[PDB]
Amino acid sequence: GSSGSSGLPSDVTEGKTVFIRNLSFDSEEEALGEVLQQFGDLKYVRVVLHPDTEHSKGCAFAQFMTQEAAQKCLAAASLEAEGGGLKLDGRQLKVDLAVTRDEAASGPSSG
Questions:
Q1: Measured between alpha carbons, how far is 34 from 37 in angstroms, rounded to an integer?
Q2: What does the alpha-carbon distance between residue 66 and residue 88 come to, in Å, rounded to a whole number?
Q3: Which residue ranges does the record assign to the RRM domain?
Q4: Separation CA 9–CA 31 (nearest Å)
Q5: What does the alpha-carbon distance between residue 18 and residue 12 come to, in Å, rounded to a whole number?
Q6: Collapsing DSSP states into helix, strand and coil, what is residue 86?
Q7: Rounded distance, CA 66 to CA 12, Å?
Q8: Which residues contact 58 (CB under 8 A, 6 or more apart)?
């Protein structure tokens, strides 16, 4: 006798992100995206700018259409991986799975 055959529900959700670091002033939302598009379709490509002026900050955030896509960008952005490492305008690019977190939570009361 036995009992089990359990299993959790597996669904698809929006959990694909990509953050680029060490961006070059030459880099642009247009180019950047076209660089991460090769791997797969990009949902949205936005490049953060300086709060003071319109100086292209050395960082940008993008999104893929498929989880596998974002992952394909990493292994490629990792110069360590088997023949990888990306570069834009003589500047290496660091792509990592980013996430939009919102610092906010309730704390447990005490006696």
A1: 5
A2: 23
A3: 16-100
A4: 39
A5: 18
A6: strand
A7: 10
A8: 21, 22, 23, 24
Q: How was this structure determined?
A: NMR
Q: What is the DSSP string of 3-62?
A: ---------------EEEES--TT--HHHHHHHHHTTS-EEEEE--B-SSS--B-SEEEE
The type of residue at 87 is K
CA 72 – CA 40 distance, rounded (Å): 8
Please state, in angstroms and rounded to a whole number, the distance separating the CA atoms of residues 99 and 106: 21
DSSP 96: E
Structure tokens at 36: 């991460």
Domain containing residue 17: CATH number: 3.30.70.330
Structure tokens at 46: 């936005």
